[PDB]
Amino acid sequence: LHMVKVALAGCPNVGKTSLFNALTGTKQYVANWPGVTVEKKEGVFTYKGYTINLIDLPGTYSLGYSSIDEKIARDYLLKGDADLVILVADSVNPEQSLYLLLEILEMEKKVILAMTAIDEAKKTGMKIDRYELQKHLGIPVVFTSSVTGEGLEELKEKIVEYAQKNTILHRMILDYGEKVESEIKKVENFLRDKKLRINPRYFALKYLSGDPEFYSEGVKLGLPELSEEERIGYRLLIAKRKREYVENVVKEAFA
Ligand SMILES: Nc1nc2c(ncn2[C@@H]2O[C@H](COP(=O)(O)OP(=O)(O)O)[C@@H](O)[C@H]2O)c(=O)[nH]1
Ligand SMILES: [Mg+2]
Ligand SMILES: [Mg+2]
């Protein structure tokens, strides 16, 4: 078989289960994530000679490391075997989905944005510009509906097209300001010789923000301890910048 492994990421209640079901039908099964009792759901479908293995991640509002659901989702995204990620966004209620998307884009993984429930969005009379989304996010964007079937085949096409690509299309460089960017550069330089399994920019962001995993690992690697005030301060600056970018994307792409 010609296998493509795809993770479905998204906030709770965005339409992940429905999209999963629409794509896999009855070809799905459940188990547990390793070492925990938390359920893992996987499914399969075939498209143009390819076999797509879909894995639904726990719903996550953000990708921190202070709850088992975020630990499972983020561990998989960072350390798992997905060839690409579909970020399932609620088209009617996009803001938190887009925030989560930015976090994942900084991991430098292949991501397709699936704006689902597009049939519901239409009814509200809202106008969503797919071109503006692709421009501001730098990734493929597909409008989908699990009710009407809109976009489902286009999504399958983009999955297989994107999986074949040698690199990621996107490259999400959000300017966090002089002071944060300076510390990022210093951290990257400090770790230049380390064999990190994730890009140094993302690592630096999480370390500076006092992430339970990355801050601890950073210190083990020789980075200095940071005061609680600095960790909170960086975490806040970074989140605030992400939120303002989301707000701008929404202003530009939604009407
Ligand atoms: N109209 C419409 N409703 C949807 C669509 N996808 C999901 N929903 C509804 O959104 C709600 C949450 O969907 P679900 O798939 O369970 O979301 P999950 O919590 O992310 O797995 C349910 O009421 C679904 O019926 C869609 O494409 N169109
Ligand atoms: Mg749900
Ligand atoms: Mg909804």
Give the count of domains, the chain.
2
Largest CA distance in the chain: 55
The CATH number of the domain holding residue 253 is 1.10.287.1770
- Is there a single domain that holds both residue 43 and residue 132? yes
How far is the centre of ligand 3, averaged over its atoms, from the C-alpha of 219 (Å)? 41
Q: How many Cα atoms are found within 13 Å in the side-chain-facing hemisphere of 203?
A: 21
How far is the centre of ligand 2, averaged over its atoms, from the C-alpha of 11 (Å)? 9
Specify whether the CB–CB gap between 220 and 232 falls below 8 A: no
Burial 212-239 (b: 16+ CB within 10 A, else e): ebbbeebeeeebeebeeeebebbbebbe
- Is there a single domain that holds both residue 250 and residue 147? no
| CB of 200 closer than 6 angstroms to any ligand 1 atom | no
- Is there a single domain that holds both residue 120 and residue 13? yes
Mutational test site, ligand 1, from 18, 143, 155, max ligand atoms within 8 Å of CB: 18
**CB-neighbour burial class of residue 199 (10 A; exposed 0-12, middle 13-18, buried 19+):** middle
Burial 95-105 (b: 16+ CB within 10 A, else e): bbbbbbbbbbb
Q: Which residues surround ligand 3, an ion (CB under 5 A)?
A: 90
Q: Which tokens go with 181? A: 């960017």
Determine if residue 36 is labeled as part of a ligand binding site. yes
- Is there a single domain that holds both residue 160 and residue 189? no
- Is there a single domain that holds both residue 148 and residue 228? no
- Is there a single domain that holds both residue 68 and residue 136? yes
- Is there a single domain that holds both residue 251 and residue 136? no
What Å resolution does this PDB entry report? 1.5
- Is there a single domain that holds both residue 44 and residue 127? yes
DSSP string, 199-223: -HHHHHHHHHTT-HHHHHHHHHTTP
Domain boundary, last residue among 115, 148, 167? 167
Distances (CA, A) of 122 to 125, 126, 128, 141, 148: 5, 6, 9, 17, 12
Question: What range does the domain containing 128 cover?
Answer: 1-167
Say how many C-beta atoms besides its own lie within 10 A of residue 166's C-beta: 4
- Is there a single domain that holds both residue 151 and residue 215? no
How far is the centre of ligand 1, averaged over its atoms, from the C-alpha of 117 (Å)? 7
- Is there a single domain that holds both residue 109 and residue 131? yes
Which ligand is closest in space to the CA of residue 14?
1
How far is the centre of ligand 3, averaged over its atoms, from the C-alpha of 116 (Å)? 9
Task: Give the method used.
Answer: X-ray
Q: Which residue, by CA, sits nearest to atom 7 of ligand 1? A: 15
Domain boundary, last residue among 100, 133, 167? 167
DSSP string, 116-177: E-HHHHHHTT--B-HHHHHHHH-S-EEE--TTT-TTHHHHHHHHHHHHHSSS-S--------
Determine if residue 82 is labeled as part of a ligand binding site. no
Specify whether the CB–CB gap between 202 and 172 falls below 8 A: no
Q: Is 54 helix (H, G, I), strand (E, B) or coil?
A: strand
- Is there a single domain that holds both residue 147 and residue 238? no
Domain boundary, last residue among 145, 167, 189? 167
Determine if residue 24 is labeled as part of a ligand binding site. yes
Of the candidates 7, 9, 249, the residue with the CA atom closest to the CA atom of residue 136:
249
- Is there a single domain that holds both residue 173 and residue 73? no
